[PDB]
Amino acid sequence: WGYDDKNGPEQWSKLYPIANGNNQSPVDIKTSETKHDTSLKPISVSYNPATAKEIINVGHSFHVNFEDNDNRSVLKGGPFSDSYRLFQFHFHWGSTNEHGSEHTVDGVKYSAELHVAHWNSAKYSSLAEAASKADGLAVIGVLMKVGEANPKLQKVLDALQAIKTKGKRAPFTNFDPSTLLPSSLDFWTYPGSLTHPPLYESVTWIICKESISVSSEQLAQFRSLLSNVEGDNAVPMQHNNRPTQPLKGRTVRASF
C-alpha cells in the first residue's frame, strides 16, 4: 500500500476491506452538525521528555517513537475514563500548500496535520494488543495552517537530514511533544480509525479547534524526505494524506 495512483487510498479497500467501514477516518467536521457535550472534561497531557526514543523513515512518512513501558507520558480527560500512554507522533502533508491535512473543518483543507498517538494502558498490556480494540487508541489531531515558521518544529526538522531514506533511524531524545500543541486544547471528538492500513477502527479522535503554524519552507523539508532506500533513484515523499471519509451517522462532539 502507499499514496501513489496504483497503491493509494482509492485502492486500499481491495486489500483492507475495512477501508469502506462505518468508523473510517479522517472526516470533514461540519461545525453546524456538532453536538456540544457538557460531560467532556478538559484534555490533560503530561509527557516526560526522557521518553523520546527514535525518529524513523518509514518510506511513506517519518515517525517519532517514545518509550511506552510505563505511565511517564500520558493523556487523560476529554471523553476518556482510562489513562492513555504516548507512543508516537507524526505528520501528514500534501504535494502543495493547498491541501495536506487529513481532517477538514467546514470543507477547509489545511497544509498538514500532526497526529499524537496513545494506547489504552488501563485496559491493555501493549500497543500491539490495543491497536485493534475499539477503545484501544487515542489520537490528538492538530491542523497545521501555512504561515509563519513554527520554531517548536525545529528539533524535528533538524533531525530529518539523518533519516533521509527509507529505513534509516536515529536516536531522538529529550523532547516533550506537548510543546507542539496549540495554546487552547478546545476540541472535537468522534470515534474513528487509523488513517492508513491497517485502518483499524480503534481510534478516539481529539481534533484541536485551534491550528498551529508551519511555513512553506518547513513543509518543503517534509516533502524532501525520500521514500526510496539509499542508493536507489531519489523519490520524494510528496504527500501522505488520506481523503475524508463518510460519517455514516457518527456524531462529532464539541468540548466548547
Q: Kindly state whether residue 103 participates in binding Zn ion, applying the rule CB under 5 A.
A: no
Residues 6+ apart with CB under 8 A from 82: 120, 121, 122, 123, 135
Which residue's Cβ lies closest to Zn ion?
115
Query: What residue 245 binds from Zn ion, ligand KIX, none (CB within 5 to 8 A, per partner kind)?
Result: none
Which is nearer to ligand KIX, 147 or 160 (by Cβ)? 160
CA 153 from centroid of its chain's CA atoms? 15
Binding residues vs ligand KIX (CB under 6 A): 88, 115, 117, 139, 194-196, 203
Q: Does residue 60 carry a catalytic annotation?
A: yes
Between β-strands 52-57 and 74-77, what pairing exists: parallel, antiparallel or unpaired? unpaired
Spatial distance between the Cα atoms of 221 and 218, rounded to a whole number of angstroms: 5
Spatial distance between the Cα atoms of 25 and 246, rounded to a whole number of angstroms: 8
Q: How many CB atoms lie within 10 A of CB 232?
A: 11
Query: What residue 253 binds from Zn ion, ligand KIX, none (CB within 5 to 8 A, per partner kind)?
Result: none
Spatial distance between the Cα atoms of 102 and 156, rounded to a whole number of angstroms: 20
Shortest reach from residue 226's CB to ligand KIX, in Å: 19
Which is nearer to Zn ion, 80 or 91 (by Cβ)? 91
Shortest reach from residue 90's CB to Zn ion, in Å: 6
Between β-strands 203-208 and 187-192, what pairing exists: parallel, antiparallel or unpaired? antiparallel
Preceding omega of 42 cis (within 30 degrees of 0) = no
Which is nearer to ligand KIX, 195 or 255 (by Cβ)? 195
Query: What residue 194 binds from ligand KIX, Zn ion, none (CB within 5 to 8 A, per partner kind)?
Result: ligand KIX
Residue of 60, 103, 118, 239 marked catalytic: 60
SS3 call for 86: strand
Shortest reach from residue 204's CB to ligand KIX, in Å: 11
User: Is 195 among the annotated ligand-binding positions?
Assistant: yes
Could you tell me which stretch among 4-12, 16-24, 107-115, 157-165 binds Zn ion (CB under 5 A)? 107-115
Per CB under 5 A, the list member of 60, 115, 166, 239 interacting with Zn ion is 115
User: Is 165 among the annotated ligand-binding positions?
Assistant: no
Contact 192, 23 (CB under 8 A): yes
Shortest reach from residue 210's CB to ligand KIX, in Å: 20
Q: What is the CA radius of gyration of the chain?
A: 17
End-to-end CA distance of the chain: 38
User: Is 239 among the annotated ligand-binding positions?
Assistant: no
| Binding site feature residues for substrate | 195-196
Residues involved in catalysis: 60
| Binding site feature residues for Zn(2+) | 60, 63, 90, 92, 115, 196
